[PDB]
Ligand binder design. Structure first.
Ligand SMILES: CCO/N=C/c1ccc(OCCCCCN2CCN(c3ccncc3)C2=O)cc1
Ligand SMILES: CCO/N=C/c1ccc(OCCCCCN2CCN(c3ccncc3)C2=O)cc1
Ligand code: NA
Ligand code: NA
Ligand code: NA
Lengths: 297, 58, 242, 245, 49, 242, 49, 99, 58, 48
């Protein structure tokens, strides 16, 4: 039980975050109202104070004499699902015959979509994102040919044994989900849920994953958040003998049921690495085109 | 239907209208979203709101 | 089995097709979603937030890049001289590329709506002045003088306590939507020009700088919408990202 | 009546006679973690007045050639007062913040600072200039402590992103002819209900001159910029021995 | 195997078989084999007029 | 026939797909199911059953394997000496691997919940003593002394009629779920450390052994759950099983 | 899956077949149609001129 | 010694807060754990070989020849269930032929 | 429907929600199970149950 | 930085020429006798 006044009148513990704004339905662009001339003192819509941090509240109606316009232009194509639910390339896997990389007929792809600029720049507009996804796998030879070859795709979550060869015991796949498909079949396609231990994935993590001294040799882990590491995607030609053809698997991702928080400035320098925002210091370019003078087009 | 509520948007402020044939709802289509917007959250997050007609600083 | 017949489109993979796909983890339930501030629902919400417009998009060497964010005004000789000009086309190469509006705009083929540019004066408190900011709708060439510019949509800005002023670039188009304008036949979709002139003069007393800067902030009005989702003109990668 | 203000919290009070209102980031006030959002089971400690108060941590000198600076939260406070002690003794932490950046001059000086809050402000390097070296920023640069750190390339915010679009984040400007301070209130921002105050910086505070400082020979040339901030609704859990990193 | 991509005005046109534009993160693309039946899609009325 | 169109995924064999397949024996009825004791419905039922935790996971030669099941305590010199330590991470290599919880845990990618370890003293009835068992949440390094360990979650155990005591390792995590922790970036999911110290001393009279053993039993609390089904890290077969 | 059986006509492309095809631009809304004089509805209208 | 597991709970060992736990227990049901297809048998039909050079083969229905699956089912003594069997055929190189 | 009740779980304590297209119910999907649990059967099978607060042996 | 840890006011010069610092009664005893060097410093109020 409580008794001293400061404890009784305390606000310690208030879990309801007071919000200063609320969403309103807006299926179409705003209409324009008829306006006429105003010759007033005191009333001054055009004057603002950008220092405050808010955007101008001046509208067409108060800056010029407007007519009435019934605007029925839709706002549907700018919803997050409209913008993001379009499949784009996020990974590529090579299974060559006589090669440098994967000459063993199998390959492990680390599930990270930041290796491709188009997709990466789009998602990086937001800090946190939560979504389900549809992954499609397009396989063919390097010339775009289709051959009668059977493949096995397996999702290996963190902690499950990664196959180390085309004949690894891990392909028994008694618990991991696997897909068996021919190159001649249409592209394999599946639905993936939101799997992070966190409420959302985050494209930016300003911190370290562990405690301790953060010396030179460990600086590679700055910005690394395990909540974003969903595992490995493994692929192999299904057989005990080497395949007769070289293969390429392109991975497409289509987000769906998307939620996003905290928008940020959009990337304006070329990407160099997947794990970080490093940019080439000797090639810092302006965000856009330039001209010779401010008084000429 | 009588499926698992495991979609990423389960319990969201906006309601969706989707299609599905499996017991897990995250397998469903993207569907149509609800068209609500809240520009002020980003464009006008001031404590004491000022009018259009007024002088912002006084 | 039940009689069916396959139609064209069979087996194709359309990247924007919104269909159903088998779930890989049956009975899996995601981590609950806690409350997180700043959720966004529509890109249009972001288009209404002002970002800095690089009117002064001329310096290009690394050490001078910050100078693109502001342009100057200074004491003149009262001949209603020209201060700066720029195209109002938001999805075109130029100053608007520095704005978030211009960038989001790059992901859509068509747009429609009024725009607004707010200019903030950052000179000393003792500096005064009146500027004429004009918007010249399509067809009108770059105004040769202030008297020509004055015939279009404009605002006469008076420096004072309110540091800023807003120029509204009202939607004045022949078509309901404009596609991105560029040199050539697509100039058909040009929005127009914006020119800034000295209405009177930048006046200052003894002891205050003779040159000050103006910062321009731009965004879209509430009647603004975009349509026909497309890929942006830039792809920020040279070789493979490792 | 919008230019004048008083901020009182704990045993500290701030006054200003040239304010430009107050920004409440993303439109919401700091609040404690609800019983349904929470996951850790131990009863938290909510020290109240001894940690939710104003701390004046640093002063920088604004110069005609300054590039701008940044500080990381809660890093700036991990070694200060009762707040710091709690952040060190506990694994879990969460709180909001009231940031008050101060800078006054004279009616004859000019210039404008952009003051903004950028969540998950990840720093990048120049990749050896040519972009072929995969360098990484050192601890002293990612978590600069109370002294903050100076930006190398403000145009891209040392992270490959345009400062021209930084206004999409909660911000205010200190335009000398108008105001002498910026006040921003930020709620807890993370994808988790609580987190480590040591390993993770929820957001960065950026103070960058966009319109350079200027004045005539003879006017006071030393124009300081001071950073004062207050935690709000601080909560801590997962108690053990004190740890600094 | 072929890839068809619709490139609206303003989107980068591929300049080679290996152009980065084929990442097709926003433009609609169709991937189909010559052996599959003819690809087929619905197109809306897209003019600004 | 009825117009249909094949979509991607056609012909694929997804091992976790829950579909319908033609029955090979029409009208076949299985043998009725009689009552059988001990039916299990959820693996979580098994996670709540205590199994022996091999805190003393050091001996490795066949004839000493049984020694891993218990660790010793004996008369000391009252300097609050350290008795044993171990990581609390249940899905990590180490002591927890001997428990059924640790093993079932290996079939899931993520887990969440409190754990509990019950220690049973097996010394003679005439032996007494007080031990301090501590749980150090993430971030705290291995306690150098008892005074440091004492600052975390702990229990002070008094030997007596009740042979055992339970240390609860309460769920104290930043995330709602933890993935299996291991050296490297995944130490982000570490649960913490458990250390056992002599609070007073192991005291015994003339005639009773100076060394006795403690057996540790571990399991999960009722708030424990697991998600994201995966294959265990071990595959108990070398070549083909004949 | 549900038992089906393909019938003749499968895979053919009949130019006058009035079927359904996947839309390339989801949630896209066309420019509204303003009033335009002289709309024609049936070629027979022209045969009477 | 009694044979039961500890009944001590978080609430009585430390001061706890209130936590509304909505973490699902659905993925640990027997069907969730077992209804995932795994390899349980392999049959070879070679041309010129030691084993089945006659173009046919008899496989004894016993799934205990593969460790992953076997270890999972052996967690229980008695099991009753229906099953879905899938047969994947190809040549030793993973090729598909008109056979 | 009007099918044979030959599923392996016919007459089980928990009810399932499945899909099927054949006359034999064992051909049906695995579906969703009922989420009941009985830990005590294994973790606390004592004849005379003791409390949490009490001393287990007295 | 050390002073800032106690009770304080941040004063901004402007139209209002003055500011008030309140030295709140923070004592162990209900009353203080006059403080001076020596054992009576027990009653000291503090520093500004
Ligand atoms: C039979 C196997 O089929 N399974 C296919 C599969 C496909 C995808 C899949 O998981 C895809 C998760 C995508 C998450 C991508 N994210 C989350 C955030 N993130 C990230 C990357 C780099 N830095 C920060 C975050 C990412 O790259 C699992 C299985
Ligand atoms: C057209 C032919 O299609 N029929 C395919 C088919 C597949 C499986 C099938 O029966 C599969 C029964 C699986 C039972 C496995 N069990 C039951 C218990 N058991 C076992 C093995 C070794 N020791 C103890 C028990 C097993 O190995 C019958 C026909
Ligand atoms: Na599918
Ligand atoms: Na079948
Ligand atoms: Na179609």
């Amino acid at each position: 039980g409580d008794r001293v006044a400061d404890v009784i009148e305390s606000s310690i513990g208030d879990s309801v975050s007071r919000a200063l704004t609320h969403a309103l339905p807006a299926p179409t662009g705003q209409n324009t109202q008829v306006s006429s001339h105003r010759l007033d003192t005191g009333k001054v819509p055009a004057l603002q104070a950008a220092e405050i941090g808010a955007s101008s509240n001046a509208s067409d109606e108060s800056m010029i004499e407007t007519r009435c316009v019934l605007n029925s232009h839709s706002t549907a194509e700018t919803t997050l699902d409209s913008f993001f639910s379009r499949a784009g390339l996020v990974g590529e896997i090579d299974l060559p015959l006589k090669g440098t990389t994967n000459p063993n007929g199998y390959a492990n792809w680390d599930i990270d979509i930041t290796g491709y600029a188009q997709m990466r720049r789009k998602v990086e507009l937001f800090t946190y994102m939560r979504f389900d996804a549809e992954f499609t796998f397009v396989a063919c030879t390097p010339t775009g040919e289709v051959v009668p070859q059977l493949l096995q795709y397996m999702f290996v979550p963190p902690g499950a044994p990664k196959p180390d060869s085309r004949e690894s015991l891990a392909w028994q796949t008694a618990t991991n989900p696997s897909v068996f498909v021919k190159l001649s079949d249409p592209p394999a396609q599946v639905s993936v849920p939101f799997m992070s231990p966190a409420s959302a994935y985050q494209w930016f993590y300003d911190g370290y994953p562990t405690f301790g001294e953060h010396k030179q040799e460990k600086d590679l882990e700055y910005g690394a958040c395990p909540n974003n590491m969903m595992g490995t995607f493994s692929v192999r030609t299904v057989g005990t003998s080497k395949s007769k053809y070289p293969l390429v698997v392109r991975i497409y991702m289509r987000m769906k049921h998307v939620r996003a928080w905290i928008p940020r400035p959009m990337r304006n320098q070329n990407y160099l690495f997947k794990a970080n925002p490093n940019y080439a210091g000797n090639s810092i370019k302006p965000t856009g085109a330039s001209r010779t003078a401010i008084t000429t087009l | 239907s009588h499926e698992n509520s495991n979609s990423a948007t389960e319990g969201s402020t906006i309601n969706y209208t989707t299609i599905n044939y499996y017991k897990d709802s995250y397998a469903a289509t993207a569907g149509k979203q609800s068209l609500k917007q809240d520009p002020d959250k980003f464009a006008n997050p001031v404590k004491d709101i000022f009018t259009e007609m007024a002088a912002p600083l006084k | 089995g039940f009689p069916t017949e396959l139609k064209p489109g069979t087996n194709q993979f359309l990247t924007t097709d919104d269909g159903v796909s088998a779930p890989i983890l049956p009975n899996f339930h995601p981590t609950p979603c806690i409350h997180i501030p700043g959720e966004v629902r529509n890109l249009l919400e972001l288009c209404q937030v002002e970002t800095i417009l690089e009117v002064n998009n001329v310096p290009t060497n690394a050490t001078s890049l910050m100078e693109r964010l502001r342009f100057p005004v200074s004491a003149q000789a009262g001949k209603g001289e020209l201060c700066a000009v720029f195209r109002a086309d938001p999805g075109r190469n130029g100053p608007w590329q520095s704005t978030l509006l211009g960038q989001l705009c790059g992901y859509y083929t068509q747009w429609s709506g009024s725009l607004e540019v707010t200019f903030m004066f950052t000179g000393s408190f003792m500096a005064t002045g009146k500027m004429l900011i004009a918007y010249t709708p399509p067809g009108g060439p770059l105004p040769k003088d202030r008297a020509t510019a004055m015939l279009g949509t404009h605002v006469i800005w008076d420096f004072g306590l309110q540091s800023s002023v807003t120029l509204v670039i009202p939607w004045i188009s022949n078509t309901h939507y404009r596609a991105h304008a560029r040199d050539g036949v697509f100039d058909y979709y040009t929005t127009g020009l914006v020119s800034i002139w000295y209405q009177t003069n930048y006046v200052v007393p003894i002891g205050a700088p003779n040159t000050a800067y103006i910062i321009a902030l731009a965004a879209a009005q509430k009647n603004f919408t975009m349509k026909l989702c497309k890929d942006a003109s830039d792809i920020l990668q040279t070789g493979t990202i490792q | 009546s919008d230019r004048v203000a008083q901020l009182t919290i704990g045993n500290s009070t701030i006054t200003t006679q040239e304010a430009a209102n107050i920004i409440v980031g993303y439109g919401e006030w700091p609040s404690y973690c609800s019983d349904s959002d929470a996951t850790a089971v131990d009863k938290p400690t909510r020290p109240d007045v001894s940690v939710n108060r104003f701390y004046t941590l640093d002063t920088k000198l604004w110069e005609k050639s300054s590039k701008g600076w940044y500080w990381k939260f809660p890093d700036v406070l991990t070694e200060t007062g009762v707040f710091g002690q709690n952040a060190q003794f506990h694994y879990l932490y969460r709180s909001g913040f009231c940031i008050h950046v101060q800078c006054n001059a004279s009616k004859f000086h000019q210039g404008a600072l952009l003051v903004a809050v950028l969540p998950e402000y990840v720093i990048g390097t120049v990749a050896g200039g040519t972009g072929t070296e995969d360098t990484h920023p050192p601890y002293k640069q990612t978590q600069p402590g109370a002294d903050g750190f100076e930006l190398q390339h403000p145009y891209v915010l040392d992270a490959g992103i345009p400062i021209s679009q930084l206004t999409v984040c909660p911000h205010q400007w200190i335009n000398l002819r108008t105001n002498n301070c910026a006040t921003i209130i930020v709620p807890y921002i993370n994808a988790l209900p609580f987190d480590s105050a040591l390993n993770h910086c929820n957001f960065g505070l950026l103070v960058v001159p966009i319109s350079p400082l200027d004045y005539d020979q003879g006017a006071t040339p030393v124009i300081p910029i001071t950073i004062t901030l207050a935690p709000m609704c601080s909560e801590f859990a997962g108690l053990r021995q004190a740890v600094t990193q």
